[PDB]
Amino acid sequence: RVTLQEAPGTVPPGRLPRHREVILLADLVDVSKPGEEVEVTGIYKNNYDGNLNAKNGFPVFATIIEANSIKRRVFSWTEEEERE
Amino acid sequence: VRKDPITKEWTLEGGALVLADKGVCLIDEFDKMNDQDRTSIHEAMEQQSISISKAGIVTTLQARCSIIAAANPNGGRYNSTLPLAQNVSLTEPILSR
Amino acid sequence: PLRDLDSEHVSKIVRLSGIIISTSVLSSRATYLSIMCRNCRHTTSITINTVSLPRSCLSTIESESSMANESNIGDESTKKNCGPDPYIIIHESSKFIDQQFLKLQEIPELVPVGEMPRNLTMTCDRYLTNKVIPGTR
Amino acid sequence: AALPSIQLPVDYNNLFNEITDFLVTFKQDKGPKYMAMLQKVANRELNSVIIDLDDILQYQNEKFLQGTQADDLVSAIQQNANHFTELFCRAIDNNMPLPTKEIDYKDDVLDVILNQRRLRNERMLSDRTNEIRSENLNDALREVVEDETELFPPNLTRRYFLYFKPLSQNCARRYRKKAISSKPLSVRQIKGDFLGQLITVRGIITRVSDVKPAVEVIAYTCDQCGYEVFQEVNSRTFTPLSECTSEECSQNQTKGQLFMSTRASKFSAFQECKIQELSQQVPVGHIPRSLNIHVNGTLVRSLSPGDIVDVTGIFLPAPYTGFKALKAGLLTETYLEAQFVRQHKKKFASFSLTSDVEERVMELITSGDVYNRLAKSIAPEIYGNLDVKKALLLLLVGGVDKRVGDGMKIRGDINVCLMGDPGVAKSQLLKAICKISPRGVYTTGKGSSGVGLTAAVMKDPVTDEMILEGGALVLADNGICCIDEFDKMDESDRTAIHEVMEQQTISISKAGINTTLNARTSILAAANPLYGRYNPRLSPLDNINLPAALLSRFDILFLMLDIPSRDDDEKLAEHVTYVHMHNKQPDLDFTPVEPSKMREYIAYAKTKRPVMSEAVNDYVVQAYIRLRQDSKREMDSKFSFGQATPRTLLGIIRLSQALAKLRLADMVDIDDVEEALRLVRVSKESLYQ
Amino acid sequence: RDEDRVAIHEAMEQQTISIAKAGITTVLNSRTSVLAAANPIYGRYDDL
Amino acid sequence: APDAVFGDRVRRFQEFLDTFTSYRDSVRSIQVYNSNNANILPHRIIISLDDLREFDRSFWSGILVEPAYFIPPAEKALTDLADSMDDHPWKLSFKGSFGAHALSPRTLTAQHLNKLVSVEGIVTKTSLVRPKLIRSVHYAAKTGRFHYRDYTDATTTLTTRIPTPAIYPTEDTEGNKLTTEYGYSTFIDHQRITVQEMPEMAPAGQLPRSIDVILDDDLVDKTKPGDRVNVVGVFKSLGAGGMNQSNSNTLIGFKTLILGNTVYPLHARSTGVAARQMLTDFDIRNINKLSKKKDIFDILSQSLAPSIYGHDHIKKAILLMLMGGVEKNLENGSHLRGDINILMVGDPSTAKSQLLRFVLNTASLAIATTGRGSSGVGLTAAVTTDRETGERRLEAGAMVLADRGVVCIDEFDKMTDVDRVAIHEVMEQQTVTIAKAGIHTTLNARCSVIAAANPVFGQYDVNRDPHQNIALPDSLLSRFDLLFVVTDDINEIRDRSISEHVLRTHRVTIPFLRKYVQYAKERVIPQLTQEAINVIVKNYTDLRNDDNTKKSPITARTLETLIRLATAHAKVRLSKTVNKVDAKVAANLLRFALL
Numbered sequence A: 001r002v003t004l005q006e007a008p009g010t011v012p013p014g015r016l017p018r019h020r021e022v023i024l025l026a027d028l029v030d031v032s033k034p035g036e037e038v039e040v041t042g043i044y045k046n047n048y049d050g051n052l053n054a055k056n057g058f059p060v061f062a063t064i065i066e067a068n069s070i071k072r073r074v075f076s077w078t079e080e081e082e083r084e
Numbered sequence B: 001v002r003k004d005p006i007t008k009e010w011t012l013e014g015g016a017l018v019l020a021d022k023g024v025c026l027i028d029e030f031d032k033m034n035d036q037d038r039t040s041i042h043e044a045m046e047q048q049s050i051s052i053s054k055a056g057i058v059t060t061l062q063a064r065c066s067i068i069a070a071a072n073p074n075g076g077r078y079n080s081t082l083p084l085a086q087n088v089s090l091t092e093p094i095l096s097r
Numbered sequence C: 001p002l003r004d005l006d007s008e009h010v011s012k013i014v015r016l017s018g019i020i021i022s023t024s025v026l027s028s029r030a031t032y033l034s035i036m037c038r039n040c041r042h043t044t045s046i047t048i049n050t051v052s053l054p055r056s057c058l059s060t061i062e063s064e065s066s067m068a069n070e071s072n073i074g075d076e077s078t079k080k081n082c083g084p085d086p087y088i089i090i091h092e093s094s095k096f097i098d099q100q101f102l103k104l105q106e107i108p109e110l111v112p113v114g115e116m117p118r119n120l121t122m123t124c125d126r127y128l129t130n131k132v133i134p135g136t137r
Numbered sequence D: 001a002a003l004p005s006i007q008l009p010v011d012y013n014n015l016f017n018e019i020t021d022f023l024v025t026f027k028q029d030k031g032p033k034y035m036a037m038l039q040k041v042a043n044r045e046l047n048s049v050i051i052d053l054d055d056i057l058q059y060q061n062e063k064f065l066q067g068t069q070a071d072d073l074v075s076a077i078q079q080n081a082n083h084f085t086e087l088f089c090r091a092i093d094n095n096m097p098l099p100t101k102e103i104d105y106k107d108d109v110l111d112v113i114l115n116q117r118r119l120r121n122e123r124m125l126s127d128r129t130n131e132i133r134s135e136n137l138n139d140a141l142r143e144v145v146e147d148e149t150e151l152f153p154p155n156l157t158r159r160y161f162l163y164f165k166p167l168s169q170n171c172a173r174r175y176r177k178k179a180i181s182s183k184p185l186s187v188r189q190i191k192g193d194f195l196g197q198l199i200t201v202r203g204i205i206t207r208v209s210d211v212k213p214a215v216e217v218i219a220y221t222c223d224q225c226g227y228e229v230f231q232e233v234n235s236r237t238f239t240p241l242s243e244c245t246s247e248e249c250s251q252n253q254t255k256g257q258l259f260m261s262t263r264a265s266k267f268s269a270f271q272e273c274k275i276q277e278l279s280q281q282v283p284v285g286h287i288p289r290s291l292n293i294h295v296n297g298t299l300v301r302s303l304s305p306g307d308i309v310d311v312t313g314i315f316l317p318a319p320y321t322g323f324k325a326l327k328a329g330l331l332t333e334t335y336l337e338a339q340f341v342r343q344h345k346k347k348f349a350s351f352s353l354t355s356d357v358e359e360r361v362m363e364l365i366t367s368g369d370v371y372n373r374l375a376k377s378i379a380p381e382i383y384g385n386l387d388v389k390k391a392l393l394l395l396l397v398g399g400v401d402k403r404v405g406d407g408m409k410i411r412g413d414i415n416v417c418l419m420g421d422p423g424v425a426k427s428q429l430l431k432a433i434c435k436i437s438p439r440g441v442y443t444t445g446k447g448s449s450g451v452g453l454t455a456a457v458m459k460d461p462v463t464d465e466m467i468l469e470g471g472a473l474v475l476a477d478n479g480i481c482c483i484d485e486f487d488k489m490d491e492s493d494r495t496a497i498h499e500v501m502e503q504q505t506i507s508i509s510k511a512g513i514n515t516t517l518n519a520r521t522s523i524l525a526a527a528n529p530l531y532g533r534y535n536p537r538l539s540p541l542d543n544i545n546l547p548a549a550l551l552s553r554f555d556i557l558f559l560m561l562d563i564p565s566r567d568d569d570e571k572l573a574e575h576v577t578y579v580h581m582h583n584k585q586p587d588l589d590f591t592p593v594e595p596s597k598m599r600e601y602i603a604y605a606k607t608k609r610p611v612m613s614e615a616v617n618d619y620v621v622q623a624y625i626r627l628r629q630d631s632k633r634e635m636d637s638k639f640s641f642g643q644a645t646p647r648t649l650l651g652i653i654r655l656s657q658a659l660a661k662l663r664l665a666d667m668v669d670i671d672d673v674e675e676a677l678r679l680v681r682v683s684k685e686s687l688y689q
Numbered sequence E: 001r002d003e004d005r006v007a008i009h010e011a012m013e014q015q016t017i018s019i020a021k022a023g024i025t026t027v028l029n030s031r032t033s034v035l036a037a038a039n040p041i042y043g044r045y046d047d048l
Numbered sequence F: 001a002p003d004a005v006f007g008d009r010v011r012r013f014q015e016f017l018d019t020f021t022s023y024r025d026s027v028r029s030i031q032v033y034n035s036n037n038a039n040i041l042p043h044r045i046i047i048s049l050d051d052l053r054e055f056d057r058s059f060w061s062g063i064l065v066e067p068a069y070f071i072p073p074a075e076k077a078l079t080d081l082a083d084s085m086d087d088h089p090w091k092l093s094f095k096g097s098f099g100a101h102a103l104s105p106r107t108l109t110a111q112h113l114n115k116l117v118s119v120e121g122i123v124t125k126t127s128l129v130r131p132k133l134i135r136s137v138h139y140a141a142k143t144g145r146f147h148y149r150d151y152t153d154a155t156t157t158l159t160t161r162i163p164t165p166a167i168y169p170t171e172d173t174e175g176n177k178l179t180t181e182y183g184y185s186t187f188i189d190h191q192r193i194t195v196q197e198m199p200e201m202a203p204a205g206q207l208p209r210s211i212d213v214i215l216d217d218d219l220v221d222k223t224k225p226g227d228r229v230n231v232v233g234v235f236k237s238l239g240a241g242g243m244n245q246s247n248s249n250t251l252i253g254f255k256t257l258i259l260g261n262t263v264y265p266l267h268a269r270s271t272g273v274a275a276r277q278m279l280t281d282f283d284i285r286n287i288n289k290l291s292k293k294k295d296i297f298d299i300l301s302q303s304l305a306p307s308i309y310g311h312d313h314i315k316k317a318i319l320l321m322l323m324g325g326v327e328k329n330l331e332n333g334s335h336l337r338g339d340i341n342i343l344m345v346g347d348p349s350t351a352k353s354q355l356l357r358f359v360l361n362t363a364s365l366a367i368a369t370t371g372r373g374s375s376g377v378g379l380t381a382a383v384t385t386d387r388e389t390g391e392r393r394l395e396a397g398a399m400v401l402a403d404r405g406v407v408c409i410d411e412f413d414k415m416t417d418v419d420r421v422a423i424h425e426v427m428e429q430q431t432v433t434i435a436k437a438g439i440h441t442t443l444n445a446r447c448s449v450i451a452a453a454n455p456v457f458g459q460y461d462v463n464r465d466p467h468q469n470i471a472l473p474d475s476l477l478s479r480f481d482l483l484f485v486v487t488d489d490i491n492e493i494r495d496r497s498i499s500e501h502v503l504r505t506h507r508v509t510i511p512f513l514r515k516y517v518q519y520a521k522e523r524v525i526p527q528l529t530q531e532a533i534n535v536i537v538k539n540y541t542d543l544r545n546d547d548n549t550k551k552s553p554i555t556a557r558t559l560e561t562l563i564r565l566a567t568a569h570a571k572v573r574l575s576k577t578v579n580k581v582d583a584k585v586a587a588n589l590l591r592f593a594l595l
């Protein structure tokens, strides 16, 4: 599970950044470490399970994003670089 | 030794000196450290290792790192008429490393 | 590395390195239990080497004897039912072993910047208890 | 069989008959005592019945010495006290005389409801007997009437409370018995073998809770049938009833909904107090323990924090309330149910003249020399120090409080400060004065600080409301507050003392608190010079650490120096070494008066309010002018602790009033002002040797 | 610090450390040898 | 129904009790005492595992390894003997050598379960002593009869039993109501305590281990938190470790604890438990004999710390402090001190700490403190904690624990004013007063003090007055009864002699001294005599009216000091009165210390 927060530069003046929760499955885990801006492609769905609807108050729901692809918005070398 | 706010587990964390083993540790405003920071810096520079005895844990960690520091003279201006030892708030044991 | 464990390793054998940061107190677990039924006093035993005490008395399915069939009925028409969870443990005739928990995390030198170290829970028993102390690699 | 039976040497019908006989027969060495009490109860002039076990023992011995048989009621009540309350109640309800005073518009509402209930009972009985007689189907008629009719039970028609008080040591010692109920015990000694008994505890009260109503029986009403339903409650919580349970609604198919009616319900006034051990009872190297006391009925508000008392009560169990995982069997908690309270030191407000007190007082005045005789009895183990003792006695007595009108206020309490060289026994005098006073408190420097003085915010366990717990200055209200090491305190404490001496209040403005406390208390302080011993080569104001104004804020400020002298040292050493050889003071021509008589006489004196005449006023103004003129020259030479100011005149007036009060007079005379000035001059001979 | 100075002065001779707090009091065993190194004031030793 | 093995074991233990006759007469003596003095003694005796070992090795091993099968038979046999010999059931306690079964909370494992153990450690927290309901008694008003019921639980017997959870009866068998008779019911006391590993034995830097102990009836309040204790009992398990029902959770195990039967407090250094020895008739004869010699004071003085050279007067003062005077309580309510205090200012190699540690090692109850080591709440017990029941409580400090003992302070001059004001009240009023949020109490702190201090200039100077050399408040010095100054002046003969002494060391015993001090303190309380009165009066007058420059001031405290020293010397003499010699000795010691 990963939490995404808006980039502070893009927030119009006077408002606060929003955020969401993201789900990464299989080989999408441990790809984006904290502190880097990324682009995430996924399916926007409710937390349909929730907990239960016997809870008092207005019937409101929480939502998540299930990620399909992730990308980033080095000190290694090779023979080509070694010769140079 | 400090709690993890999300996993609710105790953890052992070293300082920037332990974390930068085989690296470089940058310290800004070197003239404003407090007693604990001064002691940690002195131990790291003299022994290249940091000790700890806290919360039932006794161990030593490696602190083999390079240090680049910046400071300011007393009063904010350099007095060229006096030796460097009298221009900064630092002491000889640290300044000689 | 502790950070490389993942799904492919589940139920296999692994070799890991780290530093011990916490050992717990010794627990007690059973290796041999002698039990009895509080209604009809039928006795049996259990050996461990998630076991639970029987949900029902075992004197019916176990046709011990011909007179045991007689003993399982009495006083006119009423049937014999010992109830749910009829067994109790006779402690003075049982055997127990030792158990412990440990915590292992990654070496603090190589942790990535901006993130706290990861750790894992470990369980050992019998002759592997009280072997190390926190701060050991 | 399950629930077998057992045999005990206890017969309750015999004891009921004995109770009736005692209640109708006892004579005090006029008709029966308790019958007169019951008549007063019936006429609505009494609320509580006190049963003294000395009367029971006297009745038993009277019956024995003349031959006839009798049962041991005292021991039965002692060992099983909780059962005899209802036996006595039932016996008393069978003998109460009819009221000889009519019920009018100036009676309590409870009495009106009780009388209405009794009249309704009689009306139902008469209706039932008439209806049965008219049928044509006299002991049997009344029996059948009693069988078929409801009533209001006796507990809903009582108006009094009943308490027991223990067997005094004197009666048992004279009658050759062992009064268990009145042998004081510490909380440590009270174990589980004492449960269900009537026992006495000695301790000091630390906490008291506000009075609240505890419900005994709830009342409901049914509009469908018109019945009243009563639900007994003896638990910390209860479940209210929902649907009617009367005979009429029970037999029918459509039942009515009960509604709660507070006015018909039965309530009790409840308090819970904590009691802690005395120092002399705690073993070596241990911490004192506590105990819980329950108070119900007319006995509430009889305990205040800080009182050393001997509480009497029945020791009873309660359900367990600890952690579930640590419960091994049927564990219980203990509490005491209060039945009688006695104090080790009587309050002045509760004073009253009577033959017994009057004879002792009149003896004291007849003996003559009241002033010096009282003065010399304060800490008689300390040699010398006579004028300081006179000032201390006057601080005990106090002056006169004056309401000037327009809301203005002038105090009448006298503040005294002692300051001298090491080893002059200041602390002994502080402690002795604290012990003589009925509301005295003792403090020493940094041990008490911050909320130790003043008060703090905390939550009541019993009630669910916030409160303030008073500190040292609030616990000694209307008493003496003794402060040791006065010069070693922090600034905040000094400011609080300053304000308290100023206007008898403490103002606090902090997070969660904005209020004003009452501090009607006197201050008795002790201090040391700044360099240990006094240095006669320095100005007086340079030998002390306190501000000059604070010193000026004392009516009397004493200097006690230690100048070696081969003569007086001999007398002091003789006195001290004699005091160590024996346990008494050496003088034989003088007898010291014990603290109780001193307290009685001071309580009697405190009721007076002498007044100023004209000649005394002229003398006072002349003396004030002369003293004020003199003091300025001394203060210019840097040889005065402080220049005379109007506070000196007010202190002189207060001291004259105190002396007049001690003389038991309605007016002031010149000699009182003479003595006041004499003392205020004596205050400073140490500075002129 | 001064508290450390007092503690080590106790340790170097009686080879124990006495502890006294509000809920614990004990004497500990501290059998040890001390080897110290100091640097003189003014940054160099003066024979005057 | 009866069991044959049970009866055979009962018979064997009866034979054991027959062969050894000490326990038999012990039971007889307890019964005799309880009959004559009616305080009631509890019905219990102690058995030695060693004797059992010589007698029957099989029965010994059974009690050691299978207590649940062998101990109830022994208790029944003892009860049978007790019931047969006289004109509650009885219990047993165990002493002797437990061999491999003597452990500590760290080395107590699951392989020792169900066996009899003996553990050592420190008490950390006790519990409130509560009553437990055993038998209830009731009354029926309609019929006039009394009933009752019995109750039991799992911790009242060593062997497992089938539960019988009886209900509390409110009605009769015929439907009638019942009334509780609290005075005729029965309740038993109950407590639970915790024991930890000793601070002086546990590994450093490691979290400690602890175990719970359950006590009942007559062993309910035999210790307080902070004590060193030895508890012998049966390590036992209870309940089901999540086995019954599904109980998917597997982390928890079986609850374990110790059903204690023996509790022994142990004395250590710098602890609140005082040492006491048992005095035999040989010891009493020898002590009362030595009391009649004229140099007894000299011998007892020279016995103290014989490894140190000289300091004879300080040895005498330490002995006087060990013995002490008498305190007076007047009917009025006043209190007069009876303790003795000592101070030492000296050069930095004068063996002050050696004598201080000797006093720590020899006094029956002593606590060691250093200048900056303890401060604030750590001295007067001014710290507040609270139970999980809600109430706030206090816990003892250094001087609160050392009530009726001695306190050793090293590096005295390194203290501050905040704690010196605190110790003033201790040294004069011998009480501690606390006034915090929700507490107002006064604790007894009757203790003596011995301290050592350093001169201001590193070494004592004779060219300056004592005030410039001590630098301590006069009011504080007035509270010290004796002040000594020690200096080391180089001298060829003295240096030689101390050299041979220190070389001898490098290449009356204490226990008898402790017995002597205990007997003298417990038994003797002398009174003042007119002769000593005159002597002390003359000496006090002369001292107060002399021109000599002193090491300390003169007040009434000096007169009281003279009386205290005289009474303590008389206490040493085992005499019931003070003579002229004791007063003269006190005066001589005071004059030597002052001049």
Ligand SMILES: Nc1ncnc2c1ncn2[C@@H]1O[C@H](COP(=O)(O)OP(=O)(O)O)[C@@H](O)[C@H]1O
Binding pocket: D381, D382, D383, D384, D421, D422, D423, D424, D425, D426, D427, D428, D572, D576, F336, F337, F428, F556, F557
């Ligand atoms: N005038 C006196 N008469 C009898 N005893 C005295 C006198 N002065 C001092 N003392 C004794 O000396 C001690 C003085 O201590 P304390 O009561 O604290 O007074 P202070 O605080 O002034 O020194 C007391 O124990 C007291 O018994």
Ligand SMILES: Nc1ncnc2c1ncn2[C@@H]1O[C@H](COP(=O)(O)OP(=O)(O)O)[C@@H](O)[C@H]1O
Binding pocket: E013, F307, F308, F309, F310, F347, F348, F349, F350, F351, F352, F353, F354, F355, F502
């Ligand atoms: N009078 C003496 N007799 C025997 N040994 C002495 C004497 N004075 C000093 N010493 C030795 O010198 C050391 C002094 O240690 P310590 O007690 O700390 O002295 P101080 O506390 O005065 O510095 C001790 O180890 C002791 O063996």
Ligand SMILES: [Mg+2]
Binding pocket: D426, D427
């Ligand atoms: Mg004092």
Ligand SMILES: [Mg+2]
Binding pocket: F352, F353, F354
């Ligand atoms: Mg020393």
Ligand SMILES: [Zn+2]
Binding pocket: C037, C038, C039, C040, C041, C042, C057, C058, C059, C082, C086
């Ligand atoms: Zn069964």
Ligand SMILES: [Zn+2]
Binding pocket: D222, D223, D224, D225, D226, D227, D244, D245, D246, D249, D255, D256
């Ligand atoms: Zn109804």
